[PDB]
Design a protein around this motif. Structure first.
Motif, short mmCIF file in Angstrom:
data_model
loop_
_atom_site.label_atom_id
_atom_site.label_comp_id
_atom_site.label_asym_id
_atom_site.label_seq_id
_atom_site.Cartn_x
_atom_site.Cartn_y
_atom_site.Cartn_z
N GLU A 169 -38.62 -78.03 17.68
CA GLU A 169 -38.93 -77.81 16.27
C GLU A 169 -38.36 -78.99 15.48
N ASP A 184 -34.88 -73.58 16.36
CA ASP A 184 -33.63 -73.24 15.67
C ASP A 184 -33.29 -71.76 15.79
N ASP A 199 -32.67 -69.47 13.91
CA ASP A 199 -32.95 -68.88 12.60
C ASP A 199 -34.32 -68.20 12.57
MN LIG Z 1 -34.17 -74.21 10.73
#
Ligand SMILES: [Mn+2]
Ligand SMILES: [Mn+2]
Ligand SMILES: [Mn+2]
Lengths: 190, 483, 481, 189
Positions: free
Chosen positions: D19, D92, D94
């Motif tokens: 990412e 990530d 998240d």
């Molecule tokens: Mn992020």
DNA sequence: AGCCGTAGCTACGGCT
DNA sequence: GTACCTACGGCT
DNA sequence: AGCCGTAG
């Protein structure tokens, strides 16, 4: 990138060549869209004195200026075909703005010389200081630099053609030594 | 007024730009070895309290602060300058301690300033040491809302240590990095002999010392550069020829020349093989890893001479790259081509000035504190009368004048007594004030001894440089081969 | 070690969906802000970016917000701050911006580097009493900072400035409203908890767009206020006038909310070119900063201009609808709310803010009164105080001796030792006495508020009335029947 | 955008789909360039469940993944032509990283289903916390997520094909109401 | 169909 | 110096 | 050549 004016009569129309897209959009709001046109320039313009003809004619910024002015270039230049009787150089009141101005004057002198001779080339006088054009409000840019009622435009004049040819060759040419000698002779460190 | 001559307009506008790039952009100062952008980053880090003992701060916050307060230019210009100072392949003695992706030798850029974090390195503390002790002149910022340094104290010779490269107008600069132990030893030799020759200085400073190590071919190029400020230095990659099995050989490159892009160098070798401009190469791999270090492998065709292939690679690819030395720095605010001795002479003079100005500041500060303690001494000896004089006074102004007349005090002394908290009236405070005064008189005498003798001042400069050399001085990386 | 694709999809998508809903695209019912907007305004407050102070570089503001509270892209923070500074986007702008902050033509703001910003005077009302324990503070994303869970919001910002957010499984579309109308609605609700939507509509006529314009009918407004969903027809302010020689023109001076002026002009130009509309001879944008918005559509001689205008309403965004879908975060969860629910939740937030402020001001006044009581003992027995300090070898010994002899607390004794000699002057002595007497009267005033719930509610009413009189303006959007 | 590995033997080769370009360049330095390949993804990738076949085949990010894997798509899928026996999803730790992961799993399930069935699809486990991949050093990304010695990879398994078809249609499909109902039923505020 | 709004090229000098 | 790919829902 | 590094 050109934001043209309503009027198609070149006698009353003015084109402002602004430094940066930030100042470009700001001038586009503050202007009198009936008689004033805006052509934003990314930043540093191609130096035509150092560049070959193929590179000059292939440059997007150079092409956009030729298309907007509608006069043509060099031998094919037609003053009667001018789309604006006022070509205004509007750059920041700093050293880089002064450089973009030298680069723009180099292009006009080498490709659109009768445009300077007719008194169509002008220099905008924005407020002096630490603030650039991109930092100014649209109404501030109008009242101080674009409004014909309060603005102070400098008309670019050509006195000696021999002197100017030598000046454009020394300052903008490929020979560094002559440019270095000019700097050394006229340098003031007060 | 209404008109402007194109010749006058061109001459004035171009000169204004040219001069600004020369004195305020592309050229470093001979004293601290910094360009305005780098000095503003390091000063910014100092004002933001970004010392090595403190936690890392978002790069975007550092850049934004520098941009608004001192550098009114693009964020990319400030950030990319801060990035280079954090790269151990760009800076011989890194000035920025960075957290996150700060780039690699392949021309891989750093992560966006919103992801990375930064702070000062321990050596940067030496660049900013005594900045708030009136050692350097401060100037007004671009808008007049802030104060910025005209030059950093630079307690180590940073110009030669980290080098410089800048393209200005009418001129350019290309100063290579050097070894800190060698430089300080060179400064120490110069401080003992003002008539020292370039040849004698070269007994300390062998030549440039690149962070990327590698090799230097001969001393003649180094010699010309140190004597005239201009010279060509041939840099070579560290390459060896070794067996790979089955009677086959390979060229293994472990160090590449300074400022050479590893990926771009590999592509140029690949291009030569493809276009058949070089013979004997069977494979080309980049076996470089964070664990093994730099390792570029060039597989040699069986029975082909690998030493011939290596020699041809040096001639045709950046495996051998020259460093065009052109030592132009700002001397007294003006550009000047300087030799090795001039660079060291101007630096030693900056250090003498810094230490002198620091000793002068510390003396003024001590004399002022001694004067304040004298007033506090009087106040404690007559505290009952001091209290009553303040109590009988309606205003602060009345208390000030009454204290000054009754106890023969100055405005500063009376002000210090009125600022005194009740806790300063405790039993052992009169002894603490007397003890501080006696030590301060000794300190005043110590500083006065330094200012009275130029040799004592010079020895203090020598001693402080020796301390930095012993703490930050490291081994030579670049090998100078003869020849 | 291993992971089932179905379980992985369900968990990962739910985690994302929930985060967009409660921490991204939906505003809170209490302050009308999304996390990004709240972090910008709080950032401006911590940075001391009040209207009386000078403008600061947008890049410095954005960078500070990004590192301290919002760990997302700079463009997301900056473009959100830009919108809050646009008087065509925000009915009551929250950011006072310097430089190019965009236009009605869809032209964006200048880069972060060039623009500068600060709070507007109305934003002070959003942050008023934030450091007076009125709202709960929470740990930031990394635990190195503290951020507000909600702003005190002393004016009903959710309905005033409106909201538009695309979340996951749902979206929100709340239109802006007139502040005088809203506060009057809140005041009517505070006097009658059983007030109907119809009764509230006597104060709140309907939405009030910053771009003004017209609204066709009240049925759409009514449906939206009663259910939280409804279609509102917005129309441009257009007139038909003569241009000389028996010729006419259509002059547009106001366009619908969120409609791009340049894009609307291009759609009219496209229709003329493709011959999908008859009777148009010219189309010019005569808009200027001096004359305001002015779009001129020249009508062909003897052609019916009213017919052309009616066709322009049907075929171009000259008439645009606003799809009301009032979804806001109520108690940390998404909820479709009607006009009354939005006002009810807001009034409850105000009662809590004023109560918590009065409670804080009482605790701090009582603490300061306790310190002044110690200082008054110290001045009344100063000769004894001085000798007690002088006989003591250390500060700790002086502390204990003062506490013992003059019946003082640790805080009182500490304050006496911290007292400078200049506090012993006549003017400074009287200053302690004057502050203490004022404080006792103030303690009594705050205690009166906390002892009566009606006095507290009236204080909320009075403070809302003050904001209404200072920031309340005329209605811009005309609601035509 | 692909930074391929030295080895041409797919049995030992691994492809990391990272990412952001910031983490992309960081992972290219930290990796074992002999067996590990990197393909950075700008950010949010196209949801194939909502997009038309012509738009899917025209998408640059989708095409770059097809070219790198070298298996082909749908009916033309060849498992023996796989250039990597490990396709690692590295996003990530998240909510947006979780979303890119759902989007990537949607593409693999609808166009490269036997790749999941063969156990070639994996999920990288980067350090949990406030720090994203783009904020990490090249050596810490290696030691915690890329090094086979210390990394913890989650092998993506397909248990019920009927259940998965329904799950991908509910969560990623055009029908908002069924997705909204799932959120309402499983929401833990 | 596509929009609303928060999210994931150039100058300049020196190389030889 | 500048840009255009993407998710997401609801309205046209 | 096109690259180095501060600028628009
Ligand atoms: Mn992020
Ligand atoms: Mn500028
Ligand atoms: Mn070579």
């Amino acid at each position: 990138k050109l934001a043209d004016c309503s009027s198609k009569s070149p006698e009353e129309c003015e084109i402002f060549l602004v430094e940066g897209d930030s100042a470009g959009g700001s001038t586009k709001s503050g202007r009198d869209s009936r008689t004033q046109a805006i052509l934003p320039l990314r930043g540093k313009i191609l130096n035509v004195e150092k560049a070959r003809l193929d590179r000059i004619l292939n440059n997007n910024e150079i092409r956009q200026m030729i298309t907007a002015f509608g006069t043509g270039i060099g031998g094919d230049f037609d003053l009667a075909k001018a789309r604006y009787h006022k070509i205004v150089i509007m750059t920041d009141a700093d050293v880089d703005g002064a450089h973009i101005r030298t680069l723009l004057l180099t292009f006009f002198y080498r490709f659109m010389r009768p445009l300077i001779e007719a008194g169509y080339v002008y220099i905008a006088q924005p407020p002096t200081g630490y603030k650039g054009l991109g930092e100014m409000n649209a109404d501030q840019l109008w009242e101080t630099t674009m409004n014909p009622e309060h603005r102070a435009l400098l008309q670019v004049k050509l006195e000696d053609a021999i002197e100017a040819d030598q000046t454009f060759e020394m300052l903008m040419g490929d020979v560094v030594e002559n440019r270095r000698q000019f700097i050394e002779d006229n340098a003031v460190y007060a | 007024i209404n008109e402007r001559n194109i010749t006058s307009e061109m001459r004035e506008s171009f000169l204004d730009y040219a001069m600004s790039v020369i004195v305020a952009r592309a050229l470093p100062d001979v004293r601290d070895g910094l360009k305005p952008v780098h000095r503003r980053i390091l000063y910014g880090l100092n004002e933001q309290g970004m010392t090595p003992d403190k936690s890392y701060k978002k790069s975007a916050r550092i850049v934004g602060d520098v941009m608004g307060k001192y550098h009114p230019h693009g964020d990319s210009s400030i950030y990319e300058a801060m990035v280079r100072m954090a790269q151990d392949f760009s800076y011989r003695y890194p000035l920025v301690d960075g957290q996150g992706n700060f780039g690699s030798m392949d021309g891989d850029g750093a992560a966006a300033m919103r992801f990375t974090e930064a702070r000062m390195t321990k050596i940067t503390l030496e660049l900013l040491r005594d900045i708030n002790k009136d050692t350097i002149d401060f100037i007004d910022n671009y808008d007049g809302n802030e104060r910025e340094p005209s030059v950093l104290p630079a307690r180590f010779p940073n110009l030669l240590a980290n080098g410089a490269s800048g393209i200005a107008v009418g001129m350019a600069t290309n100063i290579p990095p050097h070894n800190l132990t060698e430089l300080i030893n060179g400064v120490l030799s110069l401080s003992k002999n003002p008539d020292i020759s370039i040849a004698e200085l070269m007994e300390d400073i062998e030549g440039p010392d690149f962070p990327t190590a590698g090799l230097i071919l001969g001393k003649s190029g180094i010699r010309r550069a140190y004597e005239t400020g201009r010279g060509s230095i041939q840099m070579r990659s560290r390459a060896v020829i070794e067996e790979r099995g089955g009677g086959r050989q390979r060229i293994v490159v472990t160090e590449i020349p300074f400022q050479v892009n590893k990926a771009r160098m590999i592509e140029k070798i690949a291009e030569l093989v493809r276009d058949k401009k070089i013979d004997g190469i069977t494979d080309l791999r980049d076996e470089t890893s964070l664990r093994t270090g730099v390792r570029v492998v060039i597989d040699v065709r069986k029975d082909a001479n690998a030493s011939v292939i290596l020699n041809n690679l040096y001639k045709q690819t950046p495996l051998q790259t020259s460093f065009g030395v052109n030592m132009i720095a700002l001397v007294n605010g003006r550009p000047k081509l300087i030799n090795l001795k001039e660079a060291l002479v101007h630096y030693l003079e900056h250090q003498k000035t810094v230490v002198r100005r620091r000793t002068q500041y510390n003396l003024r500060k001590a004399k002022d504190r001694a004067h304040i303690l004298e007033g506090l001494r009087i106040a404690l000896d007559h505290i009952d009368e001091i209290i009553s004089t303040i109590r009988e006074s309606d205003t602060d102004k009345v208390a000030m004048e009454s204290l000054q007349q009754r106890f023969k005090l100055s405005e500063k002394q009376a002000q210090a007594i009125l600022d005194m908290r009740l806790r300063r009236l405790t039993g052992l405070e009169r002894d603490k004030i007397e003890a501080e005064y006696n030590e301060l008189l000794n300190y005043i005498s110590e500083l006065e001894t330094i200012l009275a003798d130029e040799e004592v001042l010079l020895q203090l400069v020598r001693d402080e440089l020796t301390e930095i050399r012993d703490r930050f001085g490291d081994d030579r990386r670049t090998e100078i081969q003869l020849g």
